[PDB]
Amino acid sequence: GFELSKLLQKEHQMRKNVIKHTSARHSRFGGLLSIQTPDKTRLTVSGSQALVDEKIALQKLDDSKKWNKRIIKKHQSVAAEGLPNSLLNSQTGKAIFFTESNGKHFKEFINNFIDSGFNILLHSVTNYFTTEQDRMVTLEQVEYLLFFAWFVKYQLLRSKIDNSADIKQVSEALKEVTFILVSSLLRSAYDLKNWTVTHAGMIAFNELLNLVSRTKAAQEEDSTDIEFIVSRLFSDERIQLLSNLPKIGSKYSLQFMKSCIELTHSVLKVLEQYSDDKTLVIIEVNFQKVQANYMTEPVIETYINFLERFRELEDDSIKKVFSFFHRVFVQAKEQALLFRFDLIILLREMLSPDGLDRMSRSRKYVSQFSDYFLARLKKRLKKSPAWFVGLLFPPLHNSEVGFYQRYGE
Amino acid sequence: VDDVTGEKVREAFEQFLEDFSVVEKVYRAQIEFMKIYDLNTIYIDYQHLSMRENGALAMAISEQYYRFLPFLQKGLRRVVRKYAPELLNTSTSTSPEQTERVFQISFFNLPTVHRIRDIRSEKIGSLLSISGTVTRTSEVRPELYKASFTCDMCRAIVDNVEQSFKYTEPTFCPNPSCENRAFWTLNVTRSRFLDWQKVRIQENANEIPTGSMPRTLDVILRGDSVERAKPGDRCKFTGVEIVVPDVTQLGLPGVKPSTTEGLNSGVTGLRSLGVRDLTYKISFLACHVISIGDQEVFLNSLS
Amino acid sequence: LFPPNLTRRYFLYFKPLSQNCARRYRKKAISSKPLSVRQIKGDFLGQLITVRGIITRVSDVKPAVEVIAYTCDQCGYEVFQEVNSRTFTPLSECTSEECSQNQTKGQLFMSTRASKFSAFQECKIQELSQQVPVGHIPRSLNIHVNGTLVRSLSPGDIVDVTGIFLPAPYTGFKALKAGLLTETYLEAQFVRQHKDVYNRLAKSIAPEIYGNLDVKKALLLLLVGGVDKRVGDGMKIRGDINVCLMGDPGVAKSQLLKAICKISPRGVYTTG
Amino acid sequence: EPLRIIWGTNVSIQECTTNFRNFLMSFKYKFRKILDEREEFINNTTDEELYYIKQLNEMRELGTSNLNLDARNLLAYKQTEDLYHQLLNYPQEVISIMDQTIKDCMVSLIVDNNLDYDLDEIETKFYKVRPYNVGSCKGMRELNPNDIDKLINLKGLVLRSTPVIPDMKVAFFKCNVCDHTMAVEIDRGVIQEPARCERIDCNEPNSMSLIHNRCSFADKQVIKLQETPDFVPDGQTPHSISLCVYDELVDSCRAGDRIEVTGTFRSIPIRANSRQRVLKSLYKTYVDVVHVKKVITDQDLAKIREVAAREDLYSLLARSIAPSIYELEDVKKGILLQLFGGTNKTFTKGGRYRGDINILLCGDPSTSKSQILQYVHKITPRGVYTSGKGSSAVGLTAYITRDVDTKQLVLESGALVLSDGGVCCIDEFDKMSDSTRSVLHEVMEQQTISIAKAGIITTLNARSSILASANPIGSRYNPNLPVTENIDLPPPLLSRFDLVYLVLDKVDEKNDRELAKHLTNLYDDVLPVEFLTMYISYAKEHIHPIITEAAKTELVRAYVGMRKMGKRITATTRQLESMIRLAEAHAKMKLKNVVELEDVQEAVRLIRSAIKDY
DNA sequence: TCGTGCTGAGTGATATCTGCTTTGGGTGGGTGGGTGGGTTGAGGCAAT
DNA sequence: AGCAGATATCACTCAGCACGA
Numbered sequence A: 001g002f003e004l005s006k007l008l009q010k011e012h013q014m015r016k017n018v019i020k021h022t023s024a025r026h027s028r029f030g031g032l033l034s035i036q037t038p039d040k041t042r043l044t045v046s047g048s049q050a051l052v053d054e055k056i057a058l059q060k061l062d063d064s065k066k067w068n069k070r071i072i073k074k075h076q077s078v079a080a081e082g083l084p085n086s087l088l089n090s091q092t093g094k095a096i097f098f099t100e101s102n103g104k105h106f107k108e109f110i111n112n113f114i115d116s117g118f119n120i121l122l123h124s125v126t127n128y129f130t131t132e133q134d135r136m137v138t139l140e141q142v143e144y145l146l147f148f149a150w151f152v153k154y155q156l157l158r159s160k161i162d163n164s165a166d167i168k169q170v171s172e173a174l175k176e177v178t179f180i181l182v183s184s185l186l187r188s189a190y191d192l193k194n195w196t197v198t199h200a201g202m203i204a205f206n207e208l209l210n211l212v213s214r215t216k217a218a219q220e221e222d223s224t225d226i227e228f229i230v231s232r233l234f235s236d237e238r239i240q241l242l243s244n245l246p247k248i249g250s251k252y253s254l255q256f257m258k259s260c261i262e263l264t265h266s267v268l269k270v271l272e273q274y275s276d277d278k279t280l281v282i283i284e285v286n287f288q289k290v291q292a293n294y295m296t297e298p299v300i301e302t303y304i305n306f307l308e309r310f311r312e313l314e315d316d317s318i319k320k321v322f323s324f325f326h327r328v329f330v331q332a333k334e335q336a337l338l339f340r341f342d343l344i345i346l347l348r349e350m351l352s353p354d355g356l357d358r359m360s361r362s363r364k365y366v367s368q369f370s371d372y373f374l375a376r377l378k379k380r381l382k383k384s385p386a387w388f389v390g391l392l393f394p395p396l397h398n399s400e401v402g403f404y405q406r407y408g409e
Numbered sequence B: 001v002d003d004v005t006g007e008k009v010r011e012a013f014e015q016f017l018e019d020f021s022v023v024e025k026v027y028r029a030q031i032e033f034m035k036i037y038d039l040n041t042i043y044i045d046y047q048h049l050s051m052r053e054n055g056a057l058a059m060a061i062s063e064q065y066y067r068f069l070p071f072l073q074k075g076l077r078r079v080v081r082k083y084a085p086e087l088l089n090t091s092t093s094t095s096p097e098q099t100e101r102v103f104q105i106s107f108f109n110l111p112t113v114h115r116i117r118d119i120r121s122e123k124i125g126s127l128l129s130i131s132g133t134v135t136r137t138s139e140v141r142p143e144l145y146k147a148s149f150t151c152d153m154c155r156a157i158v159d160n161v162e163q164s165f166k167y168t169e170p171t172f173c174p175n176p177s178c179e180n181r182a183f184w185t186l187n188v189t190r191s192r193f194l195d196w197q198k199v200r201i202q203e204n205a206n207e208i209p210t211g212s213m214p215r216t217l218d219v220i221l222r223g224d225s226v227e228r229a230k231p232g233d234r235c236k237f238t239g240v241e242i243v244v245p246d247v248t249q250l251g252l253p254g255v256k257p258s259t260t261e262g263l264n265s266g267v268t269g270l271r272s273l274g275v276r277d278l279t280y281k282i283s284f285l286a287c288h289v290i291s292i293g294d295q296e297v298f299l300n301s302l303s
Numbered sequence C: 001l002f003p004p005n006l007t008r009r010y011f012l013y014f015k016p017l018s019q020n021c022a023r024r025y026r027k028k029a030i031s032s033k034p035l036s037v038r039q040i041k042g043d044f045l046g047q048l049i050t051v052r053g054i055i056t057r058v059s060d061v062k063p064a065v066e067v068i069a070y071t072c073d074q075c076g077y078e079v080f081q082e083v084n085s086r087t088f089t090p091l092s093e094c095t096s097e098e099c100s101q102n103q104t105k106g107q108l109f110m111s112t113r114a115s116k117f118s119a120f121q122e123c124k125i126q127e128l129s130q131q132v133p134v135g136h137i138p139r140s141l142n143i144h145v146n147g148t149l150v151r152s153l154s155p156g157d158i159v160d161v162t163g164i165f166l167p168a169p170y171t172g173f174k175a176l177k178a179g180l181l182t183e184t185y186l187e188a189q190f191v192r193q194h195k196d197v198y199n200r201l202a203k204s205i206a207p208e209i210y211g212n213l214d215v216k217k218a219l220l221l222l223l224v225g226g227v228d229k230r231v232g233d234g235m236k237i238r239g240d241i242n243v244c245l246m247g248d249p250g251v252a253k254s255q256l257l258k259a260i261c262k263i264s265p266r267g268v269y270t271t272g
Numbered sequence D: 001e002p003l004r005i006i007w008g009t010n011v012s013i014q015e016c017t018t019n020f021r022n023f024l025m026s027f028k029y030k031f032r033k034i035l036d037e038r039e040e041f042i043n044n045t046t047d048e049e050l051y052y053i054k055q056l057n058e059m060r061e062l063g064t065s066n067l068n069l070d071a072r073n074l075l076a077y078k079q080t081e082d083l084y085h086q087l088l089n090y091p092q093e094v095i096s097i098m099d100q101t102i103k104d105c106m107v108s109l110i111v112d113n114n115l116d117y118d119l120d121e122i123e124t125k126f127y128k129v130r131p132y133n134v135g136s137c138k139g140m141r142e143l144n145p146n147d148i149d150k151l152i153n154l155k156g157l158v159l160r161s162t163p164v165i166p167d168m169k170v171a172f173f174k175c176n177v178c179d180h181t182m183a184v185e186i187d188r189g190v191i192q193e194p195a196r197c198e199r200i201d202c203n204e205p206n207s208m209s210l211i212h213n214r215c216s217f218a219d220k221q222v223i224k225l226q227e228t229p230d231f232v233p234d235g236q237t238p239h240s241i242s243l244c245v246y247d248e249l250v251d252s253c254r255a256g257d258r259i260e261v262t263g264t265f266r267s268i269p270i271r272a273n274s275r276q277r278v279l280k281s282l283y284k285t286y287v288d289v290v291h292v293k294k295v296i297t298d299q300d301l302a303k304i305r306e307v308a309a310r311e312d313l314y315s316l317l318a319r320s321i322a323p324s325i326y327e328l329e330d331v332k333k334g335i336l337l338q339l340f341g342g343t344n345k346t347f348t349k350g351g352r353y354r355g356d357i358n359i360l361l362c363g364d365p366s367t368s369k370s371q372i373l374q375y376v377h378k379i380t381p382r383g384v385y386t387s388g389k390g391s392s393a394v395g396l397t398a399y400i401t402r403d404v405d406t407k408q409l410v411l412e413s414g415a416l417v418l419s420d421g422g423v424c425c426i427d428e429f430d431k432m433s434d435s436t437r438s439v440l441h442e443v444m445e446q447q448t449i450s451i452a453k454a455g456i457i458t459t460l461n462a463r464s465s466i467l468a469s470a471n472p473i474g475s476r477y478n479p480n481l482p483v484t485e486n487i488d489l490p491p492p493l494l495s496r497f498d499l500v501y502l503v504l505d506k507v508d509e510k511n512d513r514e515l516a517k518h519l520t521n522l523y524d525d526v527l528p529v530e531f532l533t534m535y536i537s538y539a540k541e542h543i544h545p546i547i548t549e550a551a552k553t554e555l556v557r558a559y560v561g562m563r564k565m566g567k568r569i570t571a572t573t574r575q576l577e578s579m580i581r582l583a584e585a586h587a588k589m590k591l592k593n594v595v596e597l598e599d600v601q602e603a604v605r606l607i608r609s610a611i612k613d614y
Numbered sequence E: 001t002c003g004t005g006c007t008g009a010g011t012g013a014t015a016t017c018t019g020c021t022t023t024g025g026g027t028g029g030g031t032g033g034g035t036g037g038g039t040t041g042a043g044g045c046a047a048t
Numbered sequence F: 001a002g003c004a005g006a007t008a009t010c011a012c013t014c015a016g017c018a019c020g021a
């Protein structure tokens, strides 16, 4: 009942925001508006809201347009590869509605399995599969990776909630045999252009990085043997791969994008934490070099694309996206990247009364970022009038002027 | 995309039907009663609903009954499954035809009773009660509920085609190879029909303003509520106020489409309505009817 | 850029040629010569003729559209359309230069504020009794009134309507199905409208009858009907001096009835 | 900057908005008083206090939204004379601007006054303005094309009103592929259906379905109006105009009611046929109405109690009933007692005993009998006027008819049914159909009307009193013959009336002279008709007398004495129930809850006087 | 890892042709209905 | 004449490779 009341209130706020777009009188009342452009030409719009408001007038002008630019989406049927429906293609937010008793039974079963034999099952499976890697079909790779990722993440969540049950039940993920198996699977999937196995390996690697971060948080002296693992896993080739993932993410499904984003977040988190804590040797790790590696037009594009779908995401995805944006804008000072129009339009959509609920921390992040971005954009525009034109177009790649554009000096 | 709010309404409804008590359980016992006698309709007192959950559940159902009704049925089936597994299936040799039961939810005891003259468009899709005098009753007809079709070309089968106010047919063959789009034949053997009756009522004479023509309304009865109102009776109907389109306009197989002095102009712009317009009519869908106005067998009846 | 009729703020009518003027100049006045409905044949179509008869029906004044103004949601320009028929097809697509050039598909929406309308009234004129031949049924002719001539014709008035006899072609499938047979009407242009005290009054009520002084005085009293009906207590004494005449056949009851009804302004004659 | 202008004019919307806001914020009725040349009637409190601010505050307190605006007040203010002219010329845009401005000021009041009133409730409401008094009222025959799309005033009589018609406002669409929903507004009745799903992930084209029952609708109603009788120049058939009312104005005026309507004169094209976009040259005119006008308290209870406390209440009521009728005190008293009526008893084990009183007014035609019925109608809160064998009247019995308007079967109730709880006056009882007589007998016996025709089996309550009038067979009532022969009615039907009055115009010099004096003068306080009706309603609604032991003894003794008078039967048991009802009615008249000996004494006397005539 | 074509077949889309049917009236019928209109005059029947 | 369904011929998007930088 409490959740139902909260949802009803949310719908009430949405309806209230919708009300401003509806006319009190009936449709056939017949009010005609004339709006004057900066040049002396008058455009005609219909509707009471048009007369009473200007933003509504321009929105109607836009909306009334008939011509649509073609959008081509690269859709792959999961049944084609023989895989079942899973987290890879299931829409984000799709929730299995358990009953209380059934949920309790399922949680008890999973907890007992994780405390009894997850370690042994993972060890046996990893041995059998690394002994017979080449015979793997796509289904087995996806299956192994998804099982590993799901159970590791569930144990992490339960450890967070309950102080008793702890990481030592899923400690077998840390061991190097499983780690190298997962890394080889992901790298081969990448190389052969098998995007579904790529996605599964992405998820598994994200869970592994979160796990290793928790283990380091546990004890440093006991985590020297895990500093070894961190050094092994952040190999230059792997760095390159991880960096490349985001750049390609934009082409594929939403879920791909989200996994890319999350893995990026985890990678940067571990990199920064382990650079601050101590020195890293793979070849010493230069966190700034990696960071820089992460700063290019495809990455940003990817991010933008993912953020466009903000009415279906939770607050965590928005928080990660804007953490990345903060890294870009402030820490990296690569501001030219973000001086685009996709971001401006999307931010207007986010901050509009109809876009995001006022009572939300996501709106707080968006408002802070928008304030900073608008301040810096105003300063740049005051400096260089050319940037008004510039905004419209991708960055120039000219030796002469490129620097000037990018940094203003 | 799932309806998050609708699912929570189903979750709340399941608790109400399973835990409400007044001290024996009221609706758990009622579900058992329907199991023994093999009854479809289940009666819920609206007064009881308002008590549980602070009244949020009752208020949500009241405003939006058309929207949340499908989710209420989902919740009822789950509770029926847990305690009366055999109730889900419809009631010498093996019978091959045993389809799922079509449960009907009937409400009553609403706080307010409206007049026919008090009906407005703001309450469309809301649960409310009205009172009137029955004038005319139509005969009972079978109404298509869940149609099943077979492909002309490849003989493929399409099932569970929900029907709107008009006749509906598939558009896309489920066969990858097959190209059939607009060539279908209905299959009556696998289809499901429901009882349907049209009742015409008018406002009571006492409520009629002096020197005024009585107001009229159309009430539709389904399932067990059929043939429960006779002409001349004064009945109290509880149900949902709906709006009925002009099915003609929408386009019907084999049907050529086509007070107010031409000022009743319908809505246009639809694809279906290429150059035509759509008009609307207010009707009533009732789920509960109350008509205000040998030795061994007899002995058993008495207490 | 716009039709000339759109900005016109006047109406034009033709006054027939007076018989006196035509005879002064040795000419025949066809236009002003009265004609019956029967005498109006198909060879008179398209001419200025006069009709004599009694109006039997007049419709309500309604606005007839002549020029229709449209608007473009995208362009911002105004389009116009001329209507000279019973029916018209509305515009759907913009035809402006800007629209065409830019390829923008803009929808046209009717605007009644800037449109031009003219008052319209349809009347029926029927033959007079003296104009029908022997053993024939009277005929009627339609009349169309446009502009300021509206409200110049009322039922029951004998008039000399001058107008232009024109056909009314059908449109669409009706046109094809009808054939060569055409309806007709008259475009109204000019309308000419045709036109001791007690004892003396009593005797003058009905001179043709033999002297019945008392009955005539009673008829005068009924006709004047003087009364003060202002009780104000809930009812008021009836203000009508009703008169009833009863007698054997032979008295001129019908003559008194007809005369007293003719004199009265509101007198109505009916038969049981 | 974008500058918004009303199409076809040069008036700025911003200027109109600010002018209207200033007018609403600061305006006093003293400006109207000076404008109307009534400056010397100005007081110091009401005329110097803000008017529309108070109106808005009261509207917020009561939760209403509609605001009534007097157009003359705009002229009363210097700024808004242009706004008044624009409203007269361009009503639609000005009205929309006024609605938005009203909402803006309503929210701004709470914002500035930092009141505790909830703001979310205000934000979700729709506000409207209903201007009136926009100039002299024209006639339905004076509406030319020049008046199109302009604000007009029209007075007339309502003739019919169609049922509520749902008018679409917002269209609700659903995706067939992803179960995604979106609402699209409607402009000029055109649904703006999406070409494809708005979801990035789901871009499925041409897969949107309209859910009819999940859309937002409005109330519409069409009303036919006829010009007032004075508008007819010669006496021809009056013309009529069609009206449209939306939202609150729906059901704001019933048939037969004279109203004044303010609205916009509009023209709409009519399609030739249903298949095509083709339109008729001739346009249809109608009025978009924006405002419609139609042309018990503690103090009331105190006045009623004061009147009841008066000693000569009976005579006062008798005089007030029929001021214009001379020397019929007994008939007036009987009519008063019938109007107040007896106590209705709802018995368990016994059934139903009627508390109504029936009176028959028979006698010579010269005497005043129909005027008494008209007075009774004017006084009774509920009742109908009917004459037996009368086509003009609706009818005395329920019947099944056909609704010509709608071509529908409708059960229409008769005059007796419509009089439930009131007094039904039948002017001409003598001439009446056999069927009607049987219906009257059933009504006066069972108090219900039963019909079993047209497939309908129903019973209608007819708990109403009857006050009928009758005339003799010939030119006068012959005293020699008995009443039954003279009235020419069945003895059974004539024996059911509690009181039978024989008002006879006997030729007496004194009586004739006095009647002549009264009649010629027509060319003891009296109560107003309205107050008498209110008193009767209150007495019939609240007071319920009960019989006491003394009343029982008096009734028994009176009945025994009446029976002992007469073998001839002087009285029957009906003469006892009639006395009981009359005593209860008299007790009701004095606002007493107990029947005392005085009421029984009055009852025996009224009953006896009628019996003496019999 | 940017820029500039050359190739390219796939995935559209929109500019472009092929067949009803209609009004209303029996020069489409009564296995399309009579609550989608027409419709005043004669005729037979029951209650009166 | 107008309207709804359909054919077929019209472009445009992502796809990817050779040179050089």
Ligand SMILES: Nc1ncnc2c1ncn2[C@@H]1O[C@H](COP(=O)(O)OP(=O)(O)OP(=O)(O)O)[C@@H](O)[C@H]1O
Residues within 6 Å of the ligand: C208, C209, C210, C248, C249, C250, C251, C252, C253, C254, C255
């Ligand atoms: N006083 C009279 N002087 C001259 N002619 C008279 C007189 N009275 C009656 N008539 C003639 O009587 C003829 C027939 O009578 P009329 O129709 O006037 O009245 P009526 O006899 O009362 O009628 P009805 O026969 O219809 O009852 C009329 O043509 C009228 O000319």
Ligand SMILES: Nc1ncnc2c1ncn2[C@@H]1O[C@H](COP(=O)(O)OP(=O)(O)OP(=O)(O)O)[C@@H](O)[C@H]1O
Residues within 6 Å of the ligand: D324, D325, D326, D327, D328, D364, D365, D366, D367, D368, D369, D370, D371, D372, D471, D518, D519
């Ligand atoms: N007591 C009276 N006081 C005043 N007026 C009286 C009285 N008695 C008779 N009249 C007059 O007698 C006339 C009777 O008119 P009314 O309409 O009442 O007649 P009625 O009873 O309906 O007649 P009928 O039986 O002929 O139809 C009226 O003018 C009324 O003024």
Ligand SMILES: [Mg+2]
Residues within 6 Å of the ligand: C253, C254
């Ligand atoms: Mg005669």
Ligand SMILES: [Mg+2]
Residues within 6 Å of the ligand: D369, D370, D427, D469
């Ligand atoms: Mg009378």
Ligand SMILES: [Zn+2]
Residues within 6 Å of the ligand: B151, B152, B153, B154, B155, B156, B173, B174, B175, B178, B179, B180
């Ligand atoms: Zn098929």
Ligand SMILES: [Zn+2]
Residues within 6 Å of the ligand: C072, C073, C074, C075, C076, C077, C094, C095, C096, C098, C099, C106
């Ligand atoms: Zn245009």
Ligand SMILES: [Zn+2]
Residues within 6 Å of the ligand: D175, D176, D177, D178, D179, D180, D197, D198, D199, D202, D203, D204
């Ligand atoms: Zn969709």
